[PDB]
Write a protein that binds this ligand. Structure first.
Ligand code: NA
Lengths: 276, 100, 9
């Protein structure tokens, strides 16, 4: 019932190999819907979901202009961060930013987000109050002072409480047939003998949307968290996701094991056993 | 400098049936920095016209990418995914486990 | 809808 809009910016320097690359992608929930790549011959914000294609030229012109400006601003920012950490011109570095808004089933703002990382380490984040910053170190304190002087937090609050939520609700309505449709997993349990002594039970969940899912193995009703191998939820490429959970069981004890599946698309949570 | 080695999963979009058209996926995730080399191999030779998703990243800042191509599995043909990253001394080859 | 382009770091 709740939804999110997020943008993910990646800026990466590559000294000796041109100017830093700037990439930006937008998501609603687990659905990508736009992209921008400064390495393109003619960089533009481009559609990646059918329900955004109906936006007019003024939309695509705005998003392209913002991203082209961001390409330059993030290049300047990467130069600034190199200075803050006394880093040589010779190394490559990464600046990442993720921001956006969460809304409830009624469309009201639950929380806004703006977080940044430098070389994979948290750097600065807008606090949940949308009014103050948390800086990770003395370099990020310099960014904080710049952003306080530019009244950045006030602008984030305005965006996050306003246009972010308004456009997210617009997207949720234009893409309702997919964005507001939870597809349940198709499930099954496989059995892979290892030895005469034990075998693997693997519980599969396929074709589900959104990616949030719980797969657990119980033995005599007790969760086997420590003994369960979970793979990372992975995309099928058709918008849906896949996941499995595996446990190693003593031969002949298989019926003491139950796989439990929780997912928004299911009428009721599932309990599964190996069916030989 | 944080560096994180990629996790690699090789799998099909739909349950694999010989002679039926499908998509072969190689999903790389959890890595940092973002530069990565990924090829899909058919009996050891690099497949052309492989596509990939746009660069994005997880809440822990690690990157993920899906590489994929249309394919038709057979009982002979072997498929794999060849991954190179700054964390890797030599490219990693992960074979498509048709046995699940 | 992107946030407007803001201040450098
Ligand atoms: Na939903």
């Amino acid at each position: 019932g709740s939804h999110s809009m997020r943008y993910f910016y990646t800026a990466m320097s590559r000294p000796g190999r041109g100017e830093p690359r700037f990439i930006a992608v937008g998501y609603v929930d687990d659905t990508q819907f736009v992209r921008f790549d400064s390495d393109a011959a003619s960089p533009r914000m481009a559609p990646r979901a059918p329900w955004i294609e109906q936006e007019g030229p003024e939309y695509w012109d705005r998003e392209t202009q913002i991203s082209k400006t961001n390409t330059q601003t993030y290049r300047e920012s990467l130069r600034n961060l190199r200075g803050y950490y006394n880093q040589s011109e010779a190394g490559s570095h990464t600046l990442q930013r993720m921001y956006g808004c969460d809304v409830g089933p009624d469309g009201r703002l639950l929380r806004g987000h703006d977080q940044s990382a430098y070389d994979g380490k948290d750097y600065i984040a807008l606090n949940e109050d949308l009014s103050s910053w948390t800086a990770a170190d003395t370099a990020a304190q310099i960014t904080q002072r710049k952003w306080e002087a530019a009244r950045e937090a006030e602008q984030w609050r305005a965006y996050l409480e306003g246009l972010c939520v308004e456009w997210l609700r617009r997207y949720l309505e234009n893409g309702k047939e997919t964005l507001q449709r939870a597809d349940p997993p198709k499930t099954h349990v496989t059995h892979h003998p290892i030895s005469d002594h034990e075998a693997t039970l693997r519980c599969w969940a396929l074709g589900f949307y959104p990616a949030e899912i719980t797969l657990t193995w119980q033995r005599d009703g007790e969760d086997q968290t420590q003994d369960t191998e979970l793979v990372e939820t992975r995309p099928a490429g058709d918008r849906t996701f896949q996941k499995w959970a595996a446990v190693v069981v003593p031969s002949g004890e298989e019926q003491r094991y139950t796989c439990h599946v929780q997912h928004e698309g299911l009428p009721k949570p599932l309990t599964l056993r190996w069916e030989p | 400098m944080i560096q994180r080695t990629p996790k690699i999963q090789v799998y099909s979009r739909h349950p694999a049936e010989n002679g039926k058209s499908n998509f072969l996926n190689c999903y790389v995730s959890g890595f940092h920095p973002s530069d990565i080399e990924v090829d899909l191999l058919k009996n050891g030779e690099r497949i052309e016209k492989v596509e990939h998703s746009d660069l994005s990243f997880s809440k822990d800042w690690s990157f993920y990418l899906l590489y994929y191509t249309e394919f038709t599995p057979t009982e002979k043909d072997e498929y794999a995914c060849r991954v190179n990253h700054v964390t890797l001394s030599q490219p990693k080859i992960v074979k498509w486990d048709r046995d699940m | 809808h992107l946030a407007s382009s803001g201040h450098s770091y």
